[PDB]
């Protein structure tokens, strides 16, 4: 009925109305890194 992650989060499910098997992938995330020269030099930045 469910599939499991190592932290005991859910990794997959069987749907209770259509018995198809669904993955759960977490909604896309990450670190935001702001590459900057000194604010003394410029207020322009780039984002990783």
């Amino acid at each position: 009925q469910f599939g499991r992650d190592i932290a005991d989060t859910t990794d997959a499910v069987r749907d209770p109305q259509t018995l198809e098997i669904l993955d759960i992938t977490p909604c896309s995330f990450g670190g935001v890194s702001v590459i900057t020269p000194g604010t003394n030099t410029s207020n322009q930045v780039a984002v990783l």
Partner: protein, 49 residues
Amino acid sequence: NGLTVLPPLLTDEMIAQYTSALLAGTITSGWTFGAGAALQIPFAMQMAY
């Protein structure tokens, strides 16, 4: 679960370009590429030093 792995600064291809350059200097020039500009010397003579 909030965990991530960041990549190293040098790729393994860059690190192998450094071990390449360290090999190439060591063979062609002896210790001299550590002291300054790489002074070539024949390897048979470097091993005699």
